[model samples]
Target: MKGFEFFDVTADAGFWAYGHDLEEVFENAALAMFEVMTDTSLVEAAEERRVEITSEDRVSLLYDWLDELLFIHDTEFILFSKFKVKIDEKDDGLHLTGTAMGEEIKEGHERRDEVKAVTFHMMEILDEDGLIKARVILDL
Candidate 1:
């Protein structure tokens, strides 16, 4: 099973989430944002977009990561899942590159509260082993 899990951050919404792998976790995070916008499956895969983010700290990276998704959600009203990810660091900055397939809005999409931003509240990046893990708060 994937490590992605969601938890509560507020009375109206909370998020406690994990991912066994980085890409899946990031994708799951994308799914969570998509759900927050509206219904994910309701939007069918209509196009793909590539995003690049640079941050010196993982915390900032997580914030930027979700924010990118929110831009797509709010402007396009599209639901997307990650297709690929490449993470690396260079010249005092960490970089994240990925492609996501966007879908058309469809009927029968479940309504979830809209997410406005990503929060620094209770954010963490830790591991019991060699594997990397990260957690962040999504604002709804």
Candidate 2:
């Protein structure tokens, strides 16, 4: 939980979590979402998609960013293990640009599950010492 702080709670599907952090947090959150959906193994390398996001707040925007990822799942069906994020804090909010990519599911790796949505329960955004922190929950 270096990049993210997660809280496990009882949901209809069982136990789910909330993630904190914007840069590494969102990437970890993505991993959490996909990890629940299918094994990262099936997320084999096919094509890498570039993602760039922006928002008015670090927290809310983080949720929106993850939601944007869910939208990609509809067609791309890609999972990731890595991310490169550039976050610039502005007078209005956070302006973030990131590239998400990782090694494809070549073989041997077992796929886990899929994640549906980013939840509000345990979600938050904060700027600590000039760093933006975000929290989010993913639906499994």
Candidate 3:
């Protein structure tokens, strides 16, 4: 299946990310988010950033994952192009360990919309016949 497909969401940005499981879905979702900000193809995996997140449920888990990525991007100026994510269900909640790979934004990279934050409005996660999908909306 495709990694992601963009959709119209009024003034904000939105997309449907597809994968075979939760981990892949989260990875693709990150790709979609970065694509909204710039031409991800121009980004190089020269730096690595490890991220860990714990959330009460799947929905919140996705939110926290993206939010943290955005935070790193804004503060560190990294533009991630690839991601590796693992998800586990623990006694307390869902836990995620991820590694994002990319280099800092430099000259000649095409810039796009500035995503303000991830929104829970119209967020949806689904598993259909072993295929996982996540619908995410970003506030621009």
Cα lDDT computed for each candidate against the true fold: 0.59, 0.56, 0.76
- Give candidate 1's root-mean-square deviation (CA, Å): 3.0
Query: What overall lDDT, based on C-alpha atoms, would model 2 receive against the true structure?
Result: 0.56
Give lDDT tens digits, candidate 1, residues 21-140. Answer: 554445455655555555554445678878887867765665567667667665555544544655677787888787877655555556667555665644455654655455656665
Q: Supply the TM-score for candidate 1.
A: 0.73
Top-scoring candidate (lDDT): 3
Alpha-carbon runs more than 4 Å astray in model 2: 1-7, 12-22, 41-46, 79-81, 90-92, 102-111, 114-116, 126-133
Please provide, for model 2 over 1-140, each residue's C-alpha lDDT reduced to its tens digit, 9 standing for 90 to 100: 34444556545122222333446655555655565556564344555567777787566666676677767666555444445566778777777676656545434544564344546544455556655555555565
Count of backbone clashes for each model? 17, 14, 0
Worst 10 residues of 1 by lDDT: 11-20
List where candidate 1 sits over 4 angstroms from the true fold: 12-24, 35-38, 41-44, 106-109
- Tens digits of per-residue lDDT for model 3, 7-117: 887768878888777888777788887776777675568877788988777877777777787777766665556788989888978998898777677666577777777
RMSD of 3: 1.9
What is the lDDT, from 0 to 100, of the residue 76 in candidate 2?
Answer: 55
lDDT of 1 at 46: 75
